[PDB]
Ligand SMILES: CS(=O)(=O)c1cccc(Nc2ncc3cc(-c4ccc(Cl)cc4Cl)c(=O)n(CCO)c3n2)c1
């Protein structure tokens with residue numbers, strides 16, 4: 001039956017080639033059922049593999065678990081006899097490098113918006129023991145052509161698994177001196193972010209040169225200056241941050257967390273909700289109450305399809321709200337950020353906050369935090385703040401069904417567990433017997449749809 005199913009070719013349809021990037025070619029594919037468009041990375045196995053396939057799929061699964069508004073999202077890892085297909089989210093805003101050429105320089109307010117996002121993502125990777133090792137504006141992408149949309153760190157984590165064959169001069173600006181000597185610790189990323197921040201505020205690399213040689217000579221010494229005329233107008237806080245990031249010795253260099261919490265970042269990045277946000281903000285809270293009222297099985301099903309099958313355009317309204325609720329700018333919503341946001345929501349309507357808000361969130365946190373990470377990441381937030389009618393469109397339920405049905409036509413009780421277990425991690429077969437009108441014992445597509453609509 002599967003003899004002619006293609007795994008990757010079964011689900012996706014290649015549309016065009018975007019480019020050729022180090023490890024492999026990068027294509028724009030399109031889901032055949034849902035019509036959503038993604039970016040896939042095709043990497044020839046025989047030519048690129050340093051390790052075995054079991055080890056590779058282990059690393060890429062770890063990457064599929066990274067949920068941060070400023071880190072690339074990988075949906076799945078397919079495979080055929082010749083290549084690995086790494087399906088990920090498509091970003092259409094271009095490289096930050098192009099944004100630097102257009103604007104040529106950034107006010108401290110704008111540069112703090114961009115760099116705050118690079119710090120939050122880099123902090124997330126480091127906590128998950130991931131080092132970019134090649135952080136530069138060419139590997140940061142704006143998610144859209146909207147004005148102040150998020151940036152996205154891409155192209156990382158593949159070094160241990162694959163081999164790269166290759167604009168090398170561009171990379172020389174951002175390497176740390178210890179890389180010239182063979183070290184690639186977490187601190188090398190902080191350095192790169194510091195060179196980026198220097199470039200945002202002046203338009204000149206701190207270690208400059210027309211060729212690869214001269215640049216590397218200035219990097220080795222680690223000497224830079226604020227001598228350009230345009231630095232006379234730039235604040236002392238900014239310079240103190242750049243100096244801390246470009247400390248020669250990694251042991252004395254500050255961390256990504258220290259970059260994010262630096263005062264300069266707090267001064268120019270205090271985004272907060274306004275009266276205009278009230279419509280979308282109230283829709284999120286109402287759907288979050290409906291979330292906790294639903295059962296554990298229903299909540300896990302909504303999280304599976306909110307994290308595996310949605311796209312950012314559908315959640316553009318909720319992306320802005322999530323950003324405004326993220327006071328510490330670490331990319332996640334802790335308990336305190338939910339209570340304060342729910343309180344401001346009251347003050348903007350004109351209602352007194354005085355079941356209390358604090359005791360509501362206390363009960364709501366275990367339900368939304370289905371991974372137990374201590375905070376609500378973006379996927380869990382949209383799973384609860386989104387209109388369920390959106391999540392359960394027909395085309396999106398078709399894909400869900402085919403994901404679990406190995407073989408054809410029928411979903412076993414065992415095969416069905418994959419949906420709920422992937423999210424909640426907590427054996428109720430009641431919904432199975434209720435969803436099976438034909439007494440078949442397995443759930444075809446129409447019984448599958450009826451089951452999901454009850455969860456709404
Ligand atoms: C090429 S392009 O023509 O410049 C061009 C035009 C217009 C848009 C894009 N967008 C884009 N969106 C997502 C991605 C994801 C990856 C990627 C890397 C490593 C792993 Cl493990 C998984 C993934 Cl999915 C990627 O490599 N690239 C290519 C570099 O940008 C990606 N590009 C690109």
Ligand SMILES: [Ca+2]
Nearest residue numbers: 097170171173
């Ligand atoms: Ca460059």
Ligand SMILES: [Ca+2]
Nearest residue numbers: 328332333334
């Ligand atoms: Ca937070």
Ligand SMILES: [Ca+2]
Nearest residue numbers: 369373375377
């Ligand atoms: Ca969580």
Ligand SMILES: [Cl-]
Nearest residue numbers: 224225226243
């Ligand atoms: Cl100095």
Ligand SMILES: [Mg+2]
Nearest residue numbers: 440442443444
């Ligand atoms: Mg049946």
